[PDB]
Amino acid sequence: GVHHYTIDEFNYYYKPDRMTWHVGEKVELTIDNRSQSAPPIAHQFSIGRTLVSRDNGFPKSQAIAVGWKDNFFDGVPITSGGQTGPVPAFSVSLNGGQKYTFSFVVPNKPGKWEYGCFLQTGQHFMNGMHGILDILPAQ
Ligand SMILES: [Cl-]
Ligand SMILES: [Cu+2]
Ligand code: NA
Incomplete structure (x- = not known):
């Protein structure tokens, strides 16, 4: 069947x-x-691998996150309401109190992925706004 997953966003x-x-x-x-x-x-x-951070040539106690090198949803056909197809550079951006529901088939991309928020020049990410997605091979 279709499996329903919910990810809630809070500060941060x-x-x-x-x-x-x-x-x-x-x-x-x-x-x-x-x-x-x-x-x-x-x-x-955004779901991705390989964190990119700012650089200014000086060391940082905390690296300032700017994005993922590899987007998990690259090529992944997505359905959301009346729209079907792959979405280039897919990322979900939402104002307070907005939600977005979409469906897909988990692609053959096994292993450890991460999800994250890069808004306010990576301050949300630095404050904890990131998680871990494990992709297991089909049983
Ligand atoms: Cl951020
Ligand atoms: Cu955020
Ligand atoms: Na969002």
Whole structure:
């Protein structure tokens, strides 16, 4: 069947912050921006590998996240309401209280992926806004 997954966004973390899918699973994923602040803030949800950070040539106690080198959803056909097809550079951006639901088949990309928010020049990411996606081979 279609498996329903929900990832809630809060300042500055995801619930759940860990998720496990199998290759070939039918997934319907809802990203919901449940920002609790006054005012509430926008959040990003991107699945990728290999973190890119800023560089200025000086060392940092905390590297400033700017994105993923590898997008998990590259080539992955997605359905969301009336639209079907792959989305170039797919990332989910939501104002406070907006949600977005989309469905796909988990691609043959096994192993450890990460999800993250790069907004406010990586301050959300530095504050904890990232999680881990494990892709298991089809049983
Ligand atoms: Cl960020
Ligand atoms: Cu965020
Ligand atoms: Na988002």
